[PDB]
């Protein structure tokens, strides 16, 4: 295959190979897999021209194989060349799994806020808040509030409830959810207090 060009270290050729290749990854999805070391090396070193482009094709190949953890990692590394996109099966799958990783990380850290919280790659927020904005390009989608409560973020919660139609029926809905089907007292009372303030 055209990997026959990647074999050469001339910098001019490399980017032509990657640009030509990511156009056909789907038809030859598995065939490529005996080359992922080369692409990873060409991502790790500094001073290439489109390190994001190598990270992108790596993410595509690992999404073929369903190694979702590593597709996620390289998608974080792939920067804006990926993250700016917004309408495909591939992106929606890996952003869903990113949301999942983020919410579970948040829930874990929330039990020990006093320190030594594990690091958060800010790209996770860089994707989550982008989705939050999509859930802001709209009048009052309930789901936004759902993810808000699920991720323990009172800030975007408040910003969403005050923004858009702050119909008091909606905050009565929020009180109903707070009382009806959530139980962790230490989070319950915090949500309830921010609600009494806004009220």
């Amino acid at each position: 295959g055209i990997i026959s060009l990647l074999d050469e270290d001339e910098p001019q050729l490399k980017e032509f190979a990657l640009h030509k290749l990511n156009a056909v990854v789907n038809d030859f999805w598995a065939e490529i897999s005996e080359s992922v070391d080369k692409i990873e090396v060409l991502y790790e070193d500094e001073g290439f021209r489109s390190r994001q482009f190598a990270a992108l094709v790596a993410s595509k190949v690992f999404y073929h194989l369903g190694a979702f953890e590593e597709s996620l990692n390289y998608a974080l590394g792939a920067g804006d060349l990926f993250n700016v996109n917004d309408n495909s099966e591939y992106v929606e799958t890996i952003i869903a799994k990113c949301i999942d990783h983020y919410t579970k990380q948040c829930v874990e850290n929330a039990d020990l806020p006093e320190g030594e919280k594990k690091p958060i790659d800010q790209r996770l927020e860089g994707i989550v808040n982008k989705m939050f904005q999509r859930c802001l390009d709209d009048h009052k989608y309930k789901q936004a509030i759902g993810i808000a409560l699920e991720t323990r973020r009172l800030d975007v919660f408040e910003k969403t409830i005050l923004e858009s139609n702050d119909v008091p029926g909606m905050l009565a809905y929020s009180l109903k959810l707070c009382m009806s089907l959530m139980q962790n007292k230490q989070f319950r009372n915090k949500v309830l207090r921010v609600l009494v303030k806004i009220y």
């Binding site: 055209i2 026959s4 074999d7 001019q12 050729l13 156009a23």
Partner: protein
């Protein structure tokens, strides 16, 4: 665009600056109108005739300079061009002998498994005529039977150019494979029996095997380490795991309610 079409090929091609000319050619072809595309155009057809010819010369220079990675790279590119979604491709005179040389390379580097799987594409040119393809399959057949001396007898007949750069390696690999087949547990074998085998010089290469391999270098009374193997299955204690198995059977006789 015609960068010394026949500058240093018609009369003599020893140039190392030909490498620089090829570098310029590869730098220029990447900016040509169509490489990846398969819809094609007559202009694209010209660009493709040009790419095919330059790749052919690149591969032949590779064999002339006896470089391996450049050989496999150029051959992969050309084989991608030769068969493809677009293959109008008026016949090129070098296709047959170059493909035969490719098969010789595949056989010499002991990739026999990938040999036959490349032979499916050729329906009739591999048997009736076209001696270039005939040669490597015939040698493969010769080396599938225990017949060996016939290979060395028939070595001196090659329809294309010398191509010895691969035939020497093939002979060496056949020699070492035949040696490996004569795997000997007994450390003592008569070296004269090996002398009968096609080892040629009595101590020139006998020392080479002697340095690492066992036996002696032409002794006629070999002394060295032995390749005898004993199972040593005397131990009667697979008890730790066999007990596991039994407990497991008891596990699935219960815990269903």
């Amino acid at each position: 665009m015609y960068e010394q079409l026949k500058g240093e090929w018609n009369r003599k091609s020893p140039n190392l600056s030909k490498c620089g000319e090829e570098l310029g050619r590869l730098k220029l072809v990447l900016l040509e109108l169509n490489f990846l595309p398969t819809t094609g155009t007559k202009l694209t057809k010209q660009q493709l005739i040009l790419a095919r010819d330059i790749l052919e010369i690149g591969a032949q220079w590779s064999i002339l300079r006896k470089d391996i990675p450049s050989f496999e790279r150029y051959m992969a590119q050309l084989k991608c061009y030769y068969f493809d979604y677009k293959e109008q491709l008026p016949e090129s005179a070098y296709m047959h002998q170059l493909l035969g040389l490719n098969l010789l390379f595949l056989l010499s580097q002991n990739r026999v498994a990938e040999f036959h799987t490349e032979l499916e594409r050729l329906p009739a040119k591999d048997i009736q005529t076209n001696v270039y393809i005939k040669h490597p399959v015939s040698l493969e057949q010769y080396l599938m039977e225990g017949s060996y001396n016939k290979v060395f007898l028939a070595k001196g007949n090659i329809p294309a150019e010398s191509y010895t750069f691969f035939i020497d390696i093939l002979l060496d690999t056949i020699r070492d494979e035949i040696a490996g087949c004569i795997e000997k547990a007994y450390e003592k074998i008569l070296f004269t029996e090996a002398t009968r085998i096609l080892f040629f010089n009595t101590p020139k290469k006998m020392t080479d095997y002697a340095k690492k391999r066992g036996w002696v270098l032409g002794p006629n009374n070999y002394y060295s380490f032995a390749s005898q193997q004993q199972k040593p299955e005397d131990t009667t204690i697979p008890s730790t795991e066999l007990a596991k198995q039994v407990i497991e059977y008891a596990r699935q006789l219960e815990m269903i309610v």
